């Protein structure tokens with residue numbers, strides 16, 4: 001079955017590529033100017049944000065919400081390919097996605113980030129970290145957590161084929177609140193974890209406890225969504241007509 005684990009890994013990686021238009025590999029190549037045809041427009045202030053055309057703190061923040069809505073779709077398409085998943089009780093299919101998508105959004109957002117800022121609009125634009133730190137309270141600090149994490153995370157130097165398995169492990173969490181049949185979920189994850197363990201062994205031989213160090217990052221991931229939600233609350237207490245995209249509403253409904 002170690003051959004399965006390999007085939008499982010290749011499978012996940014193919015669907016991941018099928019499901020997500022902008023990979024870490026492609027993102028890294030835009031972030032480091034492997035190109036002409038590929039360099040981004042840089043939004044670093046209010047003007048260039050205006051001229052950024054391939055209230056503002058509000059525009060950007062809903063911009064972030066439209067990205068999530070797209071992300072949820074892609075992640076969902078990807079989940080479909082995880083062997084076992086569509087066989088779960090669909091109440092559980094639903095729960096796993098609900099508690100899963102943000103952890104995956106932020107994992108993959110890391111792929112799009114460096115110390116200075118984050119890629120946007122399929123890597124066509126690049127928004128600077130200072131610029132985002134410069135929105136007015138409470139929007140002033142909604143991204144910094146993501147950045148602080150992305151910096152640690154990217155230190156792992158994982159690539160797309162590592163990430164594919166990792167995000168499957170995230171979804172298939174038998175610890176999510178309100179699962180009915182947990183044992184099938186953990187049977188799946190056990191395979192995913194083994195696939196992951198082997199992949200890291202093979203892809204980064206020279207790299208002690210990367211498997212463990214990567215699992216520990218799941219902790220940081222959850223704290224990100226934990227605090228993001230805290231902040232949604234501040235915004236909700238502090239802002240008028242702060243209505244959130246219908247889809248993001250269902251997801252945030254009883255989440256923590």
Ligand SMILES: CN(CCOc1ccc(C[C@@H]2SC(=O)NC2=O)cc1)c1ccccn1
Nearest residue numbers: 060063064065067068105118120121127248
């Ligand atoms: C700064 N960027 C990159 C996206 O960066 C993101 C930050 C946070 C999220 C999570 C969203 S925000 C929310 O409240 N709920 C969510 O699911 C999603 C993406 C963008 C992206 C598009 C337009 C403007 N700017």
